[PDB]
Design a protein around this ligand. Sequence first.
Ligand SMILES: OC[C@H]1O[C@@H](n2nnc(-c3ccccc3)n2)[C@H](O)[C@@H](O)[C@@H]1O
Ligand SMILES: OC[C@H]1O[C@@H](n2nnc(-c3ccccc3)n2)[C@H](O)[C@@H](O)[C@@H]1O
Ligand SMILES: *Cc1c(COP(=O)(O)O)cnc(C)c1O
Ligand SMILES: *Cc1c(COP(=O)(O)O)cnc(C)c1O
Lengths: 810, 810
Amino acid sequence: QISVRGLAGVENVTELKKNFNRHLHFTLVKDRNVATPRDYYFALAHTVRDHLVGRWIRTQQHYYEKDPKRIYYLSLEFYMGRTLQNTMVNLALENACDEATYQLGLDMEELEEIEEDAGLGNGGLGRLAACFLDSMATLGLAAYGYGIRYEFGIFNQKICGGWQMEEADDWLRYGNPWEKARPEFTLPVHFYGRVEHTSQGAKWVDTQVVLAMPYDTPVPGYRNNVVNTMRLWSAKAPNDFNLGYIQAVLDRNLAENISRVLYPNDNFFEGKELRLKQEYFVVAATLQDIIRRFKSSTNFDAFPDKVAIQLNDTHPSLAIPELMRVLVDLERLDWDKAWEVTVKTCAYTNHTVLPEALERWPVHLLETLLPRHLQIIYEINQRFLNRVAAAFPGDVDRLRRMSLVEEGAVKRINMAHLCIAGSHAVNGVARIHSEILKKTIFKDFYELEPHKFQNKTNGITPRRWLVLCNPGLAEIIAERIGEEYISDLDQLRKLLSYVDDEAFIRDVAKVKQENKLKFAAYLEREYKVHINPNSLFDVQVKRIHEYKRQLLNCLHVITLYNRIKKEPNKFVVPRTVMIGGKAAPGYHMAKMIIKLITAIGDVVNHDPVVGDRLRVIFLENYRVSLAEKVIPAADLSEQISTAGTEASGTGNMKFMLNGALTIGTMDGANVEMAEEAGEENFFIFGMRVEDVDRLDQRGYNAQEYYDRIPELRQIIEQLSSGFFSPKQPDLFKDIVNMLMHHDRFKVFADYEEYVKCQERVSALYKNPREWTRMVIRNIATSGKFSSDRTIAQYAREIWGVEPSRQRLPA
Amino acid sequence: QISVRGLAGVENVTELKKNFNRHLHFTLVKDRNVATPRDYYFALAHTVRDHLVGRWIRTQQHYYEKDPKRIYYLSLEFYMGRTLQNTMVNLALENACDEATYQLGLDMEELEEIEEDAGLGNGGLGRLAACFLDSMATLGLAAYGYGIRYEFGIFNQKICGGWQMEEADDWLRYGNPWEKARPEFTLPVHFYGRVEHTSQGAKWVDTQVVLAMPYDTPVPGYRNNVVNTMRLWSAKAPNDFNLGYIQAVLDRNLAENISRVLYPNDNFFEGKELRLKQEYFVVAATLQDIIRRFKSSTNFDAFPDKVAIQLNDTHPSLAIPELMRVLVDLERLDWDKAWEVTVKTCAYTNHTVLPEALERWPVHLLETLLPRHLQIIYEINQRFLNRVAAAFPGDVDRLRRMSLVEEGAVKRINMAHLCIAGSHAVNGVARIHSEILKKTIFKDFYELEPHKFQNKTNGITPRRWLVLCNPGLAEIIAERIGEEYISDLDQLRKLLSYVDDEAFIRDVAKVKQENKLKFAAYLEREYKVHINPNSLFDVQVKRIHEYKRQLLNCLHVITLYNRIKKEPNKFVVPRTVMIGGKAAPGYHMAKMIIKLITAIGDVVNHDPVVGDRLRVIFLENYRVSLAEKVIPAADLSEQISTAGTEASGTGNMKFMLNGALTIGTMDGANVEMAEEAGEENFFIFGMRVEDVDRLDQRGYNAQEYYDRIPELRQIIEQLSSGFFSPKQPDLFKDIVNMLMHHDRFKVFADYEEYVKCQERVSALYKNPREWTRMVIRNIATSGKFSSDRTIAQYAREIWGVEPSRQRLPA
Ligand SMILES: OC[C@H]1O[C@@H](n2nnc(-c3ccccc3)n2)[C@H](O)[C@@H](O)[C@@H]1O
Ligand SMILES: OC[C@H]1O[C@@H](n2nnc(-c3ccccc3)n2)[C@H](O)[C@@H](O)[C@@H]1O
Ligand SMILES: *Cc1c(COP(=O)(O)O)cnc(C)c1O
Ligand SMILES: *Cc1c(COP(=O)(O)O)cnc(C)c1O
């Protein structure tokens, strides 16, 4: 049908059909008379996976022969989403599979919808790891994702009575056809025990063994015939475990609980033992694998020439003492050599400055669980603080601030401090975030080792986030500038010469309208809800967090509603306001905000005076596959974090790429997006970082805004008095109370400038041609925000490897 | 190579090789340079399974079109063993696969050894269920095995210091290529809750839901192109289960524990809730499936014309109140109609009379777990006891004896009583066992409903137990009488006309010698132990139990040893005495007997005066795949249960079929074996049933035997004084104490007649030609003990269906 989906050759289509029928018969043991849509999805999944395996085997054997430097991306989260369409895109099979499935009388799009998201992440951090794997494969890097195969990923969100209910994400129930179990590469992981000191060094003894069983998932590069590996570990009890008889067998679940469930906190640290077990499990099994692969080539001087280990936040920080422990206690290297090897191998990416997200592990926990690691950590701290003392003689304060060990009621290890000490490179994830690291939380580390601190601004893969989710926009771009932009997104800048082309203006607007029609009809089918597709689609989709200020959005929505009710017969640009996201199950305030959003929806959407001028929709179960649907349908992207809280963001990039204008603060990558497009093509409002600091110096008094802004006092009186909760008048007293007395994120301070900037958005929406021209200037400057640019910067400036766009032979 | 393994056509072999390479590449994602023997086993397993699927699909669709009466074999145990060789035998692929694997440079026998036993049973009962599935498929019956897919089967047995250690049988670690998950046919099972009484009948409410997910394994018939189904249920939590968040997800293991582990008791009842949960789980999920299939054809009058449900012992006795509950509470049939349907549908096989094996469930357990089932059971009991009162007016004693409810400190349900009340047929498993049921434990039920009581003497499948494990014996038989005997074992009687044929006598002895050489070399390789292959192979392999009198065997072994030491320079027929079996982990005395066997081995095998005249070997981890090796190598089969304890036995049949002579008691099927072969071709010794009763009347005094038999007093003094345990002199005081004061199985009473009969065995072994002629008369009369005869009798006399040997089209 469309050019960027590849050729449907007669031979290719004939072959896909006979393999689809072979898998349905032999793999699924179904015939055509009893097969369900789900069996059809499986037969197609098996058919497309068959095209991966030759390339996977050739790629892994090429890396054995070339012995390039190998990149290990260690993350507790890989937010992969669906694999089927992505595989078809990257192997140029999409039209051939559309054709083949069409001639068997099936609709490929209907089968695509049966695939479970692999939801092994919370949000931006896990999804960054998935975008990175795609870019590393597309850039021909010998790269491995290493993580945990959680039996349960991020919970499924149900709304009952406007409240979040959590259900277990049983994503493996029907099987995962993408993964290959490798039980033959099972490795032991040790816990507990105690340290004995001999003549022949320290020895970790009387440990409990958990086995780490790897599952390999292929990661195909974009049309380069490269297939990298994502290896995820599963926990298995050894067979002598607990070994009256029956209970011993049932108690195997204590060990296997390690890989059972993803912790569902975004930008929050929960100091639980099970979480620390998960962190060691993936680090211990991964490093044995890395070292095994290295020794198939005594001499650890070469190790950092052959290994880069990237730590995705501090979650795998124990890779640093674990590498030391293997090198010192098992390989018998002297400390200083092992340390040199460790620092040149490891690099650390920081994702946030929010103090409640920073991992600070109680010493009593590390003492019990990892007694040797705590010895190595104390030793790292002693030698590190000796270099601080020598560089800043007499600065005792610097010594306590920089210590890996925090003093207090409970002693803690500051894992971020451990990462900076043990890494040759530390980066933030947007330029403003990286500047904030050098000025504030890591200022001391920066003054000691300035050379370690880098920026690597985040990106998104334009394969998933343009070609796959928005084929119609991919195509009209490809009509004019060709296909090369998909693996070289800077080529989108060639679209600036089409900003006054009438046909291109009409095509961009038509694609947006088609996406909106198709998304409106998805709402209607799956969640029986009736929305005007000619309205401005105002969408805020991201995890529910106080710093991301869904509440600021709520205040704008109630403001529009109060203005309509005061002047019902006046024209307003119609809007569909869609807010979506999950709250961490223990995050009371996030749970209240969801409830407020639905309570606003219950009043606004049933007021007959309002008409279809204003709709408020809570998008249930926001996840990667819902992002692929709603982001192409959006007109306005809400990126409204308080300045200095959103380290980067990546949602923001997805929407820029997909033809939405952005209303946001000068926060995170919003700053670089506005610089790329021009400030005049962006709806910037609110305090800058500097302004928030000025407010903190003198003190944030919310009362001042309530006393001065009659529109805002109206909203607060409505919330307080039960306008939005008539059955429970006081339902929202926690929200009011927090906004008036304990708002760390200064929602009222940005309210006036937000509402005014939202009026400018409405004004430009009235002029479709100028709105669309501004959209073109956004899409055209979105190239910087490709994860291909990000990974090329990681490779050249951190890993010391050269990306390549050259095809392997097929 | 050999004729009964089928043709190796050029096309067949070429095709097997290209499919073996396709599976290694696409299924296993290996190349030839990194594949292990285990990958080769998997590629071959996938290649042979491909030949099953066409036949499986055609067979299941033929049963939909013909709508024959359907047989449901409900068992908690299916002792399947390995599937690969059995599949090749039944599809006539063995030589083609030998050839194909040979030309890829691989040894098929080496790959066969990599397969895990499916050890989902304890012993004779589970294995009977596996032999039955094979016979039902070979006889073209529309039959389904229904059970539980235990994550852990019977434990792996290790011997340390001559003691049994148990290890978890992690048989699914590498995957099971034979099973197909059918998550789409997942059914709810209810537990706990309470009964509400409405106008509209009784209602079971506030239950906990566990999901039952079926896994289907194919059961191929012998060369008839029939493939039946074994459906095993797995327990899954529902996704709202427990639904702070983390613990709720971890607590899903409470529900999934139901299908985690097989209870490892043979002929013993353990009244644990988890066991009752397993029993309901398989009954509830199975009956919903049976009823679903029935309704795809309102009218339950026809149900027993379309459904037979066979209960394998009382383990699935709850099928009776469950069928009543579905018919009365859900389908709204009146009681008497539902009851008529239930009785005509259900039939009960009893496997033992040992009182400690009989399931007697405390009422408090059924009250909590299955409150509605207990109501239906009380109602069954009331109506049943009303028919007893009317037939035997005034016999109040008969009323308490026959009650389904036993009075006492704890009230219990007698599940066997429930089975007789609710079944149209009750059978024992050998003629003497069935007679004992009518004379003793079920005498009262027999006098009420004599027509219900049948015999169905056990059998074994000659596919696994001759063709597969003993190809050389299959072949020399096939040389002379053809191949038809494999599906018609009575044809073996044609071998009586070869009893004086010299060439046949030489071939039978040569096959036995080859089996012994090959088994001796297996001992040497896998367990570094050196045994004389010219010795008489005296083997007792079966679960370790007091009633099976491994201890009697121990006494014979110590007797031979004491005779050698008294007269070292006298000729004795050399023997290798091999005893093997598992003890239930909580069965203290069974654990002591294993230890005594190894302690005897430690003294006998290291005495230089003994030479290689007497060896005692404990065969570790006796299981189905070890039975296939040792049973073809045996000369003497030890079947030495106290008369009236071994209901049938099936080991006995395996050895008769495979060219061993039997030393045994007139117990179980030994009686019918001796009648088929002639008493003069059997080594019968010891008390008959009548003699044991006479001894019980007057009282069993073991002291009398100790006082009168100086050879036996010597043994007991050696045991007592630490001859066999010098480091712990009193190690065996429990054994001595039990033999002298509390022997329920009268070991001393059979000692004299056992030792004398063992002298007759030795005498005939000195005359190889007459030993071999006696072997021929045994093999030649073993036809009755085919499970094809057993199943044909079940089908004609219980299920009301006609077996068929006609091929389905391929
Ligand atoms: O770089 C990827 C994104 O990372 C997010 N991010 N920080 N900590 C985390 C986090 C911390 C603990 C547990 C789970 C997740 N997740 C930042 O909030 C966002 O601004 C970035 O765009
Ligand atoms: O019919 C199959 C065989 O059944 C055995 N058999 N009885 N109860 C049992 C049993 C009882 C409870 C739990 C597990 C197993 N197992 C008999 O001991 C044997 O004589 C027969 O040959
Ligand atoms: C991209 C993405 C995110 C991150 O969005 P932010 O607005 O940067 O918080 C979260 N969830 C999903 C499903 C995503 O696709
Ligand atoms: C046949 C068989 C049994 C039953 O043997 P008996 O001597 O009848 O107790 C037990 N275990 C295995 C592995 C078998 O093959």
